[PDB]
Every structure is written in structure tokens, then in C-alpha cells.
Symmetry: D3
Subunit: 329 residues, 6 copies
Amino acid sequence: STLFQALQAEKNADDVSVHVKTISTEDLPKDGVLIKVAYSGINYKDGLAGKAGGNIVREYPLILGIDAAGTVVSSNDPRFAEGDEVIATSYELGVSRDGGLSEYASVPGDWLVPLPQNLSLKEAMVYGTAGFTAALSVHRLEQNGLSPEKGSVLVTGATGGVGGIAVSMLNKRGYDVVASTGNREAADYLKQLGASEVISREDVYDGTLKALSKQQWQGAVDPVGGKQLASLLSKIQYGGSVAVSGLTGGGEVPATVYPFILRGVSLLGIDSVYCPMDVRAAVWERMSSDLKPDQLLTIVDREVSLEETPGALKDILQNRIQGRVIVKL
Amino acid sequence: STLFQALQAEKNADDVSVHVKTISTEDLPKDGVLIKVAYSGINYKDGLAGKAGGNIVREYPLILGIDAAGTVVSSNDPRFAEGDEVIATSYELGVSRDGGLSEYASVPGDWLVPLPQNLSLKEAMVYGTAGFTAALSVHRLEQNGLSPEKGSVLVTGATGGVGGIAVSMLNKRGYDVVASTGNREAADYLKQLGASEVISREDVYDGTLKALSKQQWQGAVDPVGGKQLASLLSKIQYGGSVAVSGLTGGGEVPATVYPFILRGVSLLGIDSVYCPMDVRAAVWERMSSDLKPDQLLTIVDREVSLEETPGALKDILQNRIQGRVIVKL
Amino acid sequence: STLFQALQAEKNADDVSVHVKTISTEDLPKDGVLIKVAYSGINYKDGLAGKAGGNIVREYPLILGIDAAGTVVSSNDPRFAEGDEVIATSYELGVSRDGGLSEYASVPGDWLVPLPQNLSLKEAMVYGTAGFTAALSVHRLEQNGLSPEKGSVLVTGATGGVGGIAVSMLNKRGYDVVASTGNREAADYLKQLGASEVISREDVYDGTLKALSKQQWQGAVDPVGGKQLASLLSKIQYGGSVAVSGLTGGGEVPATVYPFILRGVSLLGIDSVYCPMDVRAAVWERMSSDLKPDQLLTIVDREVSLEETPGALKDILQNRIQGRVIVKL
Amino acid sequence: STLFQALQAEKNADDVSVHVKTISTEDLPKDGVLIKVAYSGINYKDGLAGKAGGNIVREYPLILGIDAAGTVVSSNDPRFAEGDEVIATSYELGVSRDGGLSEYASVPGDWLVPLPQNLSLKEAMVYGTAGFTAALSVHRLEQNGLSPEKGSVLVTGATGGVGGIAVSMLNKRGYDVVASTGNREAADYLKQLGASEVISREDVYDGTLKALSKQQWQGAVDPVGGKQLASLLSKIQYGGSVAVSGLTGGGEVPATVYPFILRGVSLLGIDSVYCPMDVRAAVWERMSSDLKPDQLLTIVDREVSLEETPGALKDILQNRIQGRVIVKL
Amino acid sequence: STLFQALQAEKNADDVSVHVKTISTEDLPKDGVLIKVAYSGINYKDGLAGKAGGNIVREYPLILGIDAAGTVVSSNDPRFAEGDEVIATSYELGVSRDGGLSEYASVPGDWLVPLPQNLSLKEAMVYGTAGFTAALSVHRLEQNGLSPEKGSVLVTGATGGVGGIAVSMLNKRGYDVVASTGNREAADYLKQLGASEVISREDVYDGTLKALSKQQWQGAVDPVGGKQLASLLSKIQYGGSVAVSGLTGGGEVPATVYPFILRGVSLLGIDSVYCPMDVRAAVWERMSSDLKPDQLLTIVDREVSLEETPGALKDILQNRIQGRVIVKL
Amino acid sequence: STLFQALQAEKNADDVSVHVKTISTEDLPKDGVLIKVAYSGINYKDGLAGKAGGNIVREYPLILGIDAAGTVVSSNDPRFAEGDEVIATSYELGVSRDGGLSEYASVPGDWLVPLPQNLSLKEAMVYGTAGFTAALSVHRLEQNGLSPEKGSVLVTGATGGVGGIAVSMLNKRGYDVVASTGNREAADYLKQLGASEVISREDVYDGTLKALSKQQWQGAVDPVGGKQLASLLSKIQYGGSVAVSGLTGGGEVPATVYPFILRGVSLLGIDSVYCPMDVRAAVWERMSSDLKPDQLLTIVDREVSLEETPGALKDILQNRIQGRVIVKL
């Protein structure tokens, strides 16, 4: 109907600046459900979406997104009605379509998952994509035989979004959680999240690439998939599983194959971007009861506002945010 | 009690002989159930276990085996009765304990699988470990979302032990089978098994590893790892799964992480050796019903007696066997 | 044989009398199981059964009841032993067979439901038919896609029998319960039962039959019917469901077929009278845990005695009783 | 990016044209996945989409469609690979977005359902919306207690699209199918489809409405609502269910509460337009095995090309077609 | 609403005679559903019911039956309609209430199972109570771990109804059937039913009771109690199960709990009389699908009329009938 | 490697003495997984095992145990890793193999269950065999239709190992526990465990035997068989089940057949010795939550040292110990 404040990235010949422009509903896509967002949208993927050079967004007249949980204002789709609390994440939001780092977002009804009862519009955005990735990781690991009795579970990339919540989700489930960080003195935070043991990054990758190097952990959530991941698989127990979804500290994995063939481990790829609806909705249902931790609000580092986002976008992608940041609109 | 004929390996200095010898029932360990076999087979592990350097057998005074299907003649374990048809496969047997390439075998009841009703002692041996490995592959893949109407499944290293049966198992299930072999003129044999299309090893890997190639197969049974697996993972469709279980064609797998994060594919490790009895019995039941191919006996290369075993162990090390050699006792 | 007090209705010439009189053990129907009732209740059907023009009872030498929950005394049926706590509800009881508004009742074993472990004889009568009808409503709705996250559920005719209990049952389950009533000042009572947001009867039906009104509620428990139902169906959210069970607002429902075709809603009919045993027992199991509210005793209007029910049968069929009147024996 | 043939509608003042025109690939929406469409897209909805006054198409520069089963040519969406057999049905497609009555169509990956392994591109279009609607009808019915033993299910408005296929799959499932039409001499055609008994339109409704009539059918697939549905609802057996989906024979249903409250009958509404992918994929998979009739091809009235279809679009609506007309591209 | 033929038993001169007497529709118990019985069956229980000393019928002038199948003539119960093919079996029928060995039978709707779709009215009475007793035996056995591959299953008294059908049901399911009969030459008949091995009573029990004997059978379907049952238990394999249902020659069973403690076998009791509707309906559906043998008509000894029943009731009890006899009405 | 303490049994001539002797790591069987046992081993089976004419231990190179729970210290078996907490129970342990009443015990990985998360090494040994046998009893009973609403469960031999924990296990699930004791003045002890009613042995078995006695219980845990069980079976409600497990006070059971054939009761055989890994892991998982009582530590009679075990072996057999004895190592 009228105008709103929006976080829009913009290209200047060869350079991207990221501005806070005032946009109307008329400029929003005419093929989606109009929703008052009110909450969040800032992740590591959005940090790359703001910085020039990162391989994410092509057409640049684009409002940054990835993550949105608000209320339906106007819907030309019978599947959704006025007053419906919905979560809009992933797919094309913030990649090729105007996302949720802004007041009001026109997102198709096919990507909208109704807000679970045991979660608020804030609580779902405390998770975000980093929370959904962590939950989908646990969901996929448990399909292959992850259970809290066959051994302790190691979570790399702790302190971060995916790893931090994955520690809390495993702790609520009942797993003995082992947290891995490159930052010391962070032990009195990961233990607060629910980690039984806090180890260094060297405790996972120091001896450098061995074929079969002693069983240590049952499962693994690994948002740090590189040379560390190749050494991680070598330390996994029999019938174990490792969930990837991470580009931190490496892109190439010099994996052997002996942990797979001889010790029956399974490397599982986690994609939050194009996850099917029936899987997506069922995961969000687990994030409300079965995998909803007593912590949740502890992984919150800053309650940032729409004005404080341009500076907070580069805080992630530099290890300045411990946990996750939420936007309020 | 009675004297029997056994195919036994023995290391003289630095050389392994392998000969047919007469052995009494007293020589067999008193631990476990005694089974009059009558029907065994030869795998790639059996050839390596019968030659110096094979890197499987440490203590060599040992009766080769891994794979047996016979009848219980005497049991101190109440779990099994005299007259029960059972399958002795994997765990130890032919590696560190006397196996089934012999008349009579002493194997603990914890490893014995009751012969499925829709399978004979012959048919269960046509499969063997190679059949169980192929079936466990399909079983693990379907746990990760393998479905006939989601794409044509690739079969790497066909005309082999595991690969040949995997073609037949996918065809009976309903999958469009795409078989890969470096051997030309073997396309006729693969189409008999149930391959809809026969491609070369070059079609899977020869343009050298990339990161994310054109989506082609959705899933793959991959008894040949190495650099071929690395290029295979990049060609898998969204939400796919790959089952390795074999390393005959390179050790190191230069994984690229991108198919895991972006395409959500999973690399599953299948170990037929120490696969739990819980899954083992369920897989063998599938090998009698839904995964039981109509061809089945087409996989049989030739019926081989215990005296003709020493020669056939050399044949599998070379490349004189196109199908699967079974040993009649 | 033992003499007991029984609420018996009699039709002299053309008028129903209704009085409590002494009936022997030998007078009760010979076929079936004998149960010392101890706890009964007052339903809207019971008032109709004890009044001329009610259209429920044909032959009029009858003991009223429709509802009973007591202990098995004499049993010729092998399915039930002496000391079994059971619930006698619906079928022919209080309609064409001697009901439960009496000490001792002969009810066949095919209608008896064993008392659930998390329910007492008093608690089972707090529900009665009205509680069972409200539970069977939710049970039928949830089979058709009713979820406590796809929207709010309307409970029309709240304060009554089915309505008041349905409010507390959906609230315990996790639904945001909207309650509709024609009685003001009862809003604080409905919020006490577990209703969030209290509306009038006109908020459901005042615009008078549109065909496709704005989507307002996910589902509906509607013991009202009539023209209100037709206005209700048009206001239902996509893929919703409406449970009937009542005729309070009228018999004719001028449906417009469009909410069924375009919105995909369903109009589910609930009949507590001849509900199958396997469904009946499964519903009572939910009434003991899944649907059992924290309030429960709040619905109880007044606990009445056996020689006081003739007045309670006059108190029912009126806007007097708020909730449920339980009978102590 | 070559030009293609397409059936495009255009208003031009006050008279819809509907004409075969040459449209380029560039004109198709960019957001969707490109599919070279094979086979049909003719339905009753498409006739109204090609007729003035039939309120379905708002913006009239539009390519008519609904139902399209082709092969993926190019995709930016990683969900689908080049060469995937897919079905594009309902949602938008031929109403607001460009449809599938044309060579090459752009449809987003959220609506594309992979072609079932037991179905071909022809067979999927033999079904269409009419096939999916009738299959969703019997799927929704069976969720409410529809079983072969309970009675002889009625299919009103047979001979048509939805009704004709509803008779076939219901017969395949095992039900005793009763079909009713408003025309004689088609009894041979209906008994060929799988109808056990052929009755007239007068047998269902002609003696005018009653509150509760003699129980007859148990279940009903009803693509002909109106006054016929209300009299049909009273002729339903205990615990029965009726599937709507069709508005022919009137859009006003004078239902009378009693079949719902006293017999436990449920009126289920089927919407093929916005059926979720979770159910859609499960229904399409049933249409390949569980609900795939031995006939199936008898429903096909005639096979038409892209040109000659404007006449076929005028043939529908006027009830000239017996079964379903298919296109070939 | 006039007269019919009925097989009735009277106690004139204080001794049972049994004849075929003409009985009106008014004479039947009015508290049930009136059903035109087409097809019945003579069971061993029917033999004692029409004989002095047989403790089944207490107070006489009663129509025998225990088994009935046919269509509903007139229903006072809303759950059933005119023309419903239904099976009346057990509970009080032919015991304390008028049975099914008669044209027209009034039986309450709580004891009526709707005829399974893959069964005709003739095929339903081929089973009768003895077929239900055999099926409930298999159903209870399979709940305790009775599996085709786990060993051979023994069937005692396979000449009769309960035994003969149990042989055919096990064979269709896949079990290795060992038939046990007191009479030879019936071996040819048993092998046609589906028995792989024929054995005399002596091989099962020829005196001498042991606490633990040699393991021979996985399980047992036993319609014969007494000392033979005790001899069977000691011969059952580990985790086995015995299904008891009869009394033919023996009432006391000298158990030793050694097969229960050391072998872990389970002694199951099968009562077809008061089996709950929940299980009863589920068992009858198995008798039409997975347990339905290809033979069926082989177990049929003779097909008699209603006036030929009095002689057929004396044919049973004296071991003359080789299987079951059907009564056409 | 190094020496430890073990409860060794030795038969010098014809006596059997049992001492605490020093045994090295190399003396243990070199085929199992080395586990430093932390807790317990005392059971009624151990008493007869260390006794002349006890008839459990055949040859005497044995160390006592049957029960063990500790941590894996070095493993050649790839299924288990050094640091895994496991329970070694039943099979050949303490009977034909070195048990768990010793520091460091060698046991093959096929018998080891991963310690349930909610159970400590002490808590798992508070249960032991006589506790797993009680849990398997409930698990087998519930498979035959044992539910809290059906009646009040009976427990014979309360005070003992199996019966004592059974009382607390049935009470946790919600069952009405009726416990039977040999000695009086021990009713308060069972009130602490969870028994609502405490009765004598005469209340179960006093007035000899009857074919069909009055129904009372529905289900019974029976670690005391013999003539008591035969009278117990006749006092079970319809569709009931009785779990054995014990030989205390009688081996022969003079049972009839009437409770089985007329009431549908089932005598279920529970063997904890060779219970498959499939069920064993599922039962232990229930013992950590579903069956885990609030008491648990109440059944602990007294802790003991490894040096004081020879005195504790004489403390059992005779009725001195009320509960279970734990050994700290």
C-alpha cells in the first residue's frame, strides 16, 4: 500500500556498497504473498551476499534476505490468509528475489512454512537458516543411525551459527556433545550451550591426514568442511555419520575411502536452500519440541536493528559474532 | 568325528601355497555351531587371502572362506537346531578364522543367518558377500531417498562381483540401470543382467575432476573408488546418494564438498564385514523377495568343485571371471 | 437379587411422567453384563427421552441414562470379570434400552469400554456423551489435517455440552481456541476453560450466506448446525474441516459447495451413538492423556443425586445448565 | 532458443479469441523451469479459460494450459536435471501463468512432480486434472473409512472427465462401482470402464429431497454437486464419505444436517488446484500402481494436435466429449 | 415375513433329538439384525450342541449354527443396510442364541463382520469358525515371532477343519508344513492342502513325556490338547510358539516350563468365540488376501442341504468328515 | 599384560570351592573385547554355578559373572572403540565362559550392548540379569495385549531378583501391581517398590487345582512356576498373558487347557540367556526410560567388594537377600 524501510545491496560498476533505501509495495514482486516480516535475516550467506566478489547474487537491484518470519498482510493465494504467522527462508530469498532483511516481503506460498505452535516469530528467527541447517543435519544423521549411546558426537565450527545451535540441539536430545573451536576461553560458553567437552581445532586436525586414525566420535556436525573433514571421517566410529554444510577453513576434501569401506561411515550433505517442503515442515516441527533446547536465547549475540545491519553484515565473515544476530522490524 | 576336504592356505617363509587338505572335525574350534556346508564361493578377498601381499590375512595357517551356506549338523547353542539351513558370511571367517571354502565349518551362532524361505543354498551362494554388499548398498541408498522415479541410477565397475549383481537388483526393483565398464564387448552381458544403458569408464571419469558437473544419475553403486568417485559425486542429481564399498581403482578420493552442500548429496559407506545381525537378516530377506532378480543364475560363471578351487582363486585375481564363481561341495 | 433405585420414565396415555422407583435385579434385561453404576450424568438427549415429543424413545417402560461408568458385579460374559471398572455409553442405552441413570444397569459386553488408567469413574462422567462427542470431533478433524499450527479453531455453541468440553480439549492439545456463544458475561468462563478470543454468534453468522467469505478459522467444532454452519463453511481456511454432531441452530444447512471445491474444506459428521468399539476405545485413550485438560472439573456445573434428577431433566432442555451435571449414586 | 507453436487466448474488447500462435522462448517467464511439453492439457476448466464470461482468467494475454507432462530442457533450479520426465499440473498454469497446451512451457520447480516409474508421458496426460481429481477423491475418501467391504460406491456424473476415471480406479482397487449418467446407451461404455451397475440420473435424485433416505452406497465420488448432492448425502450408509470437486448441476447444495449427525457421513471437498506437493506426489504414485486401472486407455475419446484444439476447446463445455480428449506435441 | 426352514434341537423326554422344523420370522429373537443366511457349516462345536452330554447348549429349544453368511433383509440398526453381505460367527450364536443353520437369522450388529471383498458367500463358509480359528492361530503366532525361514511348523489333527485349513494357510504364507494325523492314507489329501511332510500321532507323541526333547519344529498349530501338547512343547525350537485351540482327546497338559525357561517358547490360547471386533475384522481380511490359499475347495468334503444337516452333525464327532462340510441354503 | 582380581571357580576332585585368585590379561580368551568391569555380577544363577551339583557350569576353568558393565579398554573388533561403555550379559558368560565378577573380562562384541544414555554403569547392574528378565517379561506380555486399563497385574516371588524389580517396572508404566510374597511382614517393602496390594502365596495357590477358576488378574509375572502356575493360569482374565522365567518351588506344571482355549490366555516363555541382539538392545533401551522406576536404588539390598563375593554366593540360594547385590570394582 505504502512505503517501508529496506536493506538493499546495490552494484556500482564493479563495487557493491549496501544501502538502507525506502521501498514501496509496488516495487515488490507481483507473484507472492505479502508479509510483514518483523524479524531477522542475517547469516554468513548474507555476509557474502553484501560483499563484492562473493559468488552468490548476479542481478544486483536486490534486497538482501535469507531468513524471515512474519505475519501475512495480503495474499492472492488461497493457501494463506491475513493474520497467518509464517516462516520464509531459503530458495531464492536474498539470492535472486527480494528477501527478508526488510520490512515487508513478497514471497511465494510454496516457500512458506506456517509457524510452529511452540515457537514465536522471534524464536524461529533465533534459529534462522543456521538453525534450520543444524536441525536438518541432526535429522539426516538420525536417519543413518545416530543415537545417544553408541558414542559422543563432535561438533566442529562451534561459536558459529550452525555449530553453536547444533551443540544445543544435541544436548537437549541427550547426546554427549564435543565442541571444537579455534578460539580459547570460549569453553565457558559452549558448556553453557550444552557441550560436555571443549577441544581445540588441532584435536580434530593436527597430525594431518591419516587413512584410519582411531575411533573417537560416533557422529559429527561439520560446518567446517575442508582438510579437517578428511581427518574427521578417519576418526569416526563404526556405522557413524558426518553432516557437512560448511565452507569455513577449506573447500577441497582429501578424503581417503577406508573409513567408508572398512568402518562403514557415511558423509551426509546438508542443503538448507532447496530442501523439500514435507522435509522442511517436519524439521521445523522438531525445532519446536524434540530438538528445541533449553538454551535457544543464549546463542543470541546482538539484538540488532535494521539500521545496525550494514555494520553487522561484515561482523560475520570475520569471527566477530559469537552465536547469531537477530534483526527487529 | 569324520574327515573332510578343506581348501587351506599356509605361508612357507614369504610365500603362500594354498592346497586341498584332509582335516578332522577336532581341528575346527569347539566354539560355535558345526555346519556341513555344501555350497561356497570365491570373492576378490578370497583371492587376496590366498596370495602373499593380499593384505587381509596376518596369521596364515587358516582355511579360506568368507561365504558359506549349509545345514547345522551339531549345535551346543540352543538358538540353532540340527537340520537348520543357515548362511555363514562375513565377520571373521577366511580372514582370521577358518571359513566356508571347505566341507564342514565351525562358526558361532551369532553370525549365522537362517536361510530365507524363497532362497536355496545354491541361490544364496550365487549372491555371497558380493550379493550382500550390492543389496546393502541399495538398502542404505533407499534410506537416504533412492527412488525409481527420481533418475537413472549409475553402476560403477560393472561385470565385477558386486557391480554385476547390483545391476540385476536395481532392475528388479524398478530402477533405470546405467552400467559403467572399461571392458568393451561386455555390454551384451550387462543388458542381460538388467542394464538399460552401457557406458564406459571414460563417461564417468576421464575429463578429470571438476567440482559441480551436469546432473546425470541421482545415485550410484560404486565398487571402484579413487579419483573416479570424486568425478562421480559432482554428476549426482539433487538429494542423491552414492554407495562405495570398493577401492579397486585408486585409494584417495579428492572430494570437492560442493555437491554435498549445494546439491545435498550423500556419500554412504557400506561394510558387509561387520554389518549388524539386525540389518543383515533384513537385507537377506530383501534378497529373497523384492531385490531377488529374475536373472539370478545368469550371474553364475561356472560351477566349481573343491578340487578346482585353487585355480579359480587365481582366476579372480586376474580377469578370467565375468560373473560369479560358486563352489559345490 | 437386590432392590435398587432407578430413574424410570413412563407414558400414561399421552404424557411422560418420569419418576424414581424401586426396581429389582431380576427385572433388568437378562442378556448382558450387570454393572453397579455409582456415577451417571445429565445429557440433552436424556431430557428429550424424559419428555413427550422428544423423539428418542419409542416404547415407554424405560429407565433413562445413555451414560454410565461403574464396576462389574454379576458377569456371564467371559470378557469381563468381577471388579472391572467400565464405561457404559451410547448405542441403545437410555434410548431403547434401560440406561445408566440408575443403581445397577444391564448393559451387554460389546458396548462396555474398560476405564482408562488416567481416569476415574467420576472423571469419565465429567465427560459423558458430551465429552466423547467433543473428543471424537477433534479425533475426526485431525484425521483430515487439523494441526495446532495451521490456524485457530472455532468452537460454536460454547457453554453447552459439546462446546464447553471441546474448548478445553483443543486448548490442552495446543490449539488457539476461538469460542462462539450467544451469552455475554460468559466470556470470562470460556477463557477459564481455555478459550483465547471470545466472539458472538453473529461473528459467525450475521452477513447471511456469502459462499466464499474471508478465511478466518482453520477448523470448527460445531454442535449448532443450521444456517450458521453454511456461513461457517465459507469462512474456513484452506484444507480445513468442520465437525457437526448437533442441530441446535437448525436442521437445514444451505451449503454453497464452493468451500469444498475451491477451498478444499470438509464437513465431517460425528455420531457418538454407534461409534465402532476400536475407535471408541482409542478415543477414550486420548480422553485420558492427549485431550485431558488441566481444568476438567471446571466444566462440572453441579453434582446431583439420583432422587434429584427429575428436576435436573427439567433444568436441562434450558439455558440454565452451564457445562455438565454429573449424577452421584 | 527457437520459436514454437502455442495455444494463446486474447480478449480484445469483449470477445475471447483463442488462436494457435508462434511464441518465442524469451516470452516465457524467466523464473520457471523450461520443459519441452509432451502430450495434452484439455479440461473443462480450459474451456471456461477459453470462453468469455467464465471467470477464471483475469489478465487475458495468456497461454492456456493446466496439465502438462514433458521433459526438462534447461534448469537454473538444481532440483531438476536436463532429461527429467516431469508433470506440470494445476496451481497456476493456464489461469494466471502460462500453461501447457503448447510446445515448451516455463513452470517453477515447486509445482513439478517427477513422472512415476510405472507411468508414461501419455498415461499421465490421459489422467490430467480429471485423473488427479478423481484419484485425490478416492484418496481423501479412504482417509475417512472408505473400504471395499462396506458397500457399493457411487460415481455420479460418469462418462465425463472426473467421473469416467473415478469408475476405473475404483474398480481396480476392488470396489463394486455404481455409475450414474443423464444419458442412456452409454451403459456399455461404463461397464467397460469397470462399473458393476449402471443407473440413471433420476435414480440418485428425482423424487425430491429427504432428510434421511434408504442407505444405498457407503461412498460417493461426486463431480456433479447441486441439488443431486443433497439427496445423495441422505442415501449414504453409516460412517460413509462423499467427495465433491465438481460444481456441475448447480452450485447450491440444500443439505440437511441429519446424515452427518445421525449416520456419521462426511462431505469431503477435493481441490486439485492447490494440493500440496507432499500429498500430490503420494497421489501420483498411487495413480501408477494402487489406482492404475487395467483399461486406462478407454477413457481417451480422441487424440488431437496443437492445431485443431480450439475446436476441441469448444467441444468441451457443451458435453460432446465421452471421456477425455488428449493433445500431442 | 412368513415361514422358513431351521435346524433345531429339542430336549423331548429329557433327551436331544435334533430335526428340521418350520419356524416363522416372528419366532426369532427381535433384538438383532435380520439376515437371509446363504451357506453355513458344521463344526465340532455344533456336534456337541446337538447331542446330550455336549456342554454347549444349556436351555434348549434352540437353532444350532455358530456359523452364518448372507445378506441383510431388514435392519433396525443404522450401521447396516439392506443388501449388506455379512458374516455371523461365534459369541452366542448356536450356543445361547439361535444360530445360522437356518434360512433367516437374527443377530445383533456388534457380532457382524462385513464380507471381505476377495471372498464370496460360499468361500466365507468354507472357513467358518474353524477357518477363523486357524487364521487367528497364525495371526497370534506371527505376533510372537513365527517366521517362514525360522523352521518347519507342525499341524496336529490336520484331517479336521481347524487343522486342514491351517495347513493350507501356512503353505500359502510360505511355511514348511508338517501335518500330523492319526489316520493314514489321508497323507495324499494333506499334501494337496499344502503339507510338505506327513506324520503320525506316534512320531509326535507315543507315550513317554520328556522335559526337553530334540528340537524339531519352529512352531505348532494345535487343535488337540492333552499329553500330545506337552510332548510338542519339548520339541519346539528357540523362540517358538504353540497355538492351542482344541480339546480332541485330552484336557490336562503336563507342562514342565523347561521349554518356556530354557528354550523360551510361548503357549498361546486361541478363542474364536469372544474375539474382539478389532481383531476379528483384521483376521477376516487376512483370510481374503495373504492367508487365503489357492486350494480352499480341496478342504471341502461335501456340500449338503439343510435337511441333510442332522446326519452331518453325527458324521462329525466320529471322525468321518475329511475337512469341512458346507450347507447351502 | 598385567594382573587383576577374579572370582575363579575350581573343581578339585569332586568338590567345587570358588576363590578370589590373581589372573593376568593374557590368561583371558584372546578373541573377545577387553573391558574393565565396573559393577556387579551376583545372581541366583551364579550360586548354583559355584556349587557342586548345581548343573550350570560344565568344565571348570571358569570365572563367575553372567552380569558385567564396564568400559572398553582396547579392541581389535572395529565395532567397538576404546572408551565405549558397554554391558556384558548372558549368553556363555559365567556358564561356559569367564564372567563379569572380575576386573577385566574378555567377551566378544556380538554380546555387547552400548550402555543406554539414561543408565549408569551402576544402574545397569542394579538391574542385571534378574531385571532384564523382568523387563523382557513386560515386553513380551505387552506384545500379547497387556495394558494398564485391562486389569491388575500379578507378581509372584516378590522379594526375589526378577519379581522385585518387576513390581517397580509395572508400577512405573501405570499398571496396578499385586505382589505375592513367601514370607509375611515384608508388605511395606513392596509398597516402596510400587505394589498397591500385597497378598500371600495361598491367595494365588492354596486349594489345589481347578480347570477354570474365577478371573482376577489379566496378566502375571511369574518367576515361581510349578504347581502354583497351573492354578495361576485358571485365575487370569480374558485375552490375558503370563510370563514365566523361574523354576523356584516346582518344575512340573499340571496345567489344563481351558484357560487357553476358552479365555484366550497365553503362557509366554522368557529366556534372558540367548535373547537376540535385536530384542536385547530394545529392552535395555526401555529400561532407561519406559520401564525405569523412580525407586531403582531401593531394590539395592547391599553393595559388596570383589573379595567378599564368595560369602555372598552362600548368602543366596537360601532366602537371606531381599533385592539385589552389587559388586564395586
